Amino acid sequence: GHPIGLFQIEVLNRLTYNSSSPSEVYCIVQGKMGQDARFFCPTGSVVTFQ
Amino acid sequence: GHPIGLFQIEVLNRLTYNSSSPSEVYCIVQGKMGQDARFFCPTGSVVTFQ
Amino acid sequence: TMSPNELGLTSAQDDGPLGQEKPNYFLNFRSMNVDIFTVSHTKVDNLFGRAWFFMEHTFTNEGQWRVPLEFPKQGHGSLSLLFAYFTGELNIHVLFLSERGFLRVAHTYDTSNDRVNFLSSNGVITVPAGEQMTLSAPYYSNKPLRTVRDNNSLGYLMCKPFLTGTSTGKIEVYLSLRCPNFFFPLPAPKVT
Amino acid sequence: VGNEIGGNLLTKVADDASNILGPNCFATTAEPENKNVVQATTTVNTTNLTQHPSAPTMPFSPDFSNVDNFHSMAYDITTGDKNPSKLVRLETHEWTPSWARGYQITHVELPKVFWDHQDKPAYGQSRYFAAVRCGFHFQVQVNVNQGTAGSALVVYEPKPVVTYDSKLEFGAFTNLPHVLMNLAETTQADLCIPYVADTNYVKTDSSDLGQLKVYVWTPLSIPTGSANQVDVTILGSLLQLDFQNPRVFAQDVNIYD
RNA sequence: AUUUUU
Predict the structure, then answer these.
(1) Do C1 and D57 touch (CB under 8 A)?
(2) Left if phi > 0, otherwise alpha if psi is -120 to 50, otherwise beta: which for D28?
(3) If we measure between CA atoms, which residue out of D17, D4, D244 comes closest to residue D134?
(4) What is Dmax (Cα atoms) for chain D?
(5) How far is the CA of C161 from the C1' of E4 (A)?
(6) What span, in angstroms and rounded, lies between the C-alpha atoms of B5 and D23?
């Protein structure tokens, strides 16, 4: 339903490098539930998996 | 008399490097006897030292 | 006190073994577990203890209905796709929509299509016309575990209706499971 | 002396300037998950040295007993291990009538015969080792109807004997582990032979450690009607086996000088 | 297999 919120990752300090190091790197964002996570009512489906 | 065996040092993963590091290095192979090493009969000589 | 590891600073390559219930905190925060209902709806036994539609068959003759039972990629039962192996009781809910007659129902994990030609000891429960029954088929599988994905992950279901006159109809089938044993969770499924 | 104090020089300061609402800041310092360590792992005759190890992983609440509690395979757990010591048919030759005494019926290359063909239980392992030290348990079987008679000499001949065989007097071979077995009386002979050699270990795939033979003590006296095709079979079992020296697949290696 | 419920 309603979004979890706005997720923003801004640059604080330019990624520094040297002659033998990359001028840009790759990033990965993962997500999971907390130790207090809970789910409650089972409802119909909004999509079909494979 | 009989050889100790076949000694082989094969490459497993290519030696990696960068702009300021060598693309090839030097290696040294040393040999000694184990803590259980023993010698038994003294025999004649097969060579002359200096 | 709290270590920097529990404050967000960690290393993804140091997560093994699988299953690390590490606590995450910061000032003015702590894992708060608040319950709304007297029990869990996340427990495998509870969630799956609730049926879900499977398929429907429209009969005209007294022929037999053989169908490879499998886990759903459609209802809340899809949560099973997160696992690789299953084993346990299987609840089959059958609705016999007919004016006058009887419906023979049976279930087996046996792949042979001839051990079913007769229905001798494959559980021939009888649902009178216009009735519905819920039979719980035991794990009579020849394989210790049932890959959860297989087009026949669940054993085959048989339906040989015993009609009386020109009467015809349709047999809607939905199902759930009793106490399910799932193992070795695999990666989440994709969408169509 | 410094460079780590970041935790109690920030955790305390606040704890010193805190009001009823408690501290407005907490700081904790410690070592990174990726520390400067070295890991070493050793398997059979192997050693893996890693100076940049990572936390080992494994499935959820795993069971490494690896033993099938249902025993879908009803056999001893150590079946595969002992398999190579299993009893096998080493030879089967036919006792050709009219063979004078002393005549050699059949021989058998010891110990390389247990790896005689790629269909021998021990053939598998025998290929990955150059050295061997084992004991034997032979069972020479010879069947003959009651009407017929005769006798054969089943004897074990170490390399020393095999080497100088012609220099030895037959009829004295009874000094070696043997079994004068009188046909029409015994159908099988049993011989338990321990490791016998002038060297601690014998080269795998070698005729060393001697060889078992079967001679004609007294030729076969086969009556007119009686059958005339007597077969002599040699079975072998390894009381104890030991493969030590590692080597390439079935490559001739010299353990001797 | 308090792998019906306490």
Answers:
(1) no
(2) beta
(3) D244
(4) 122
(5) 32
(6) 70
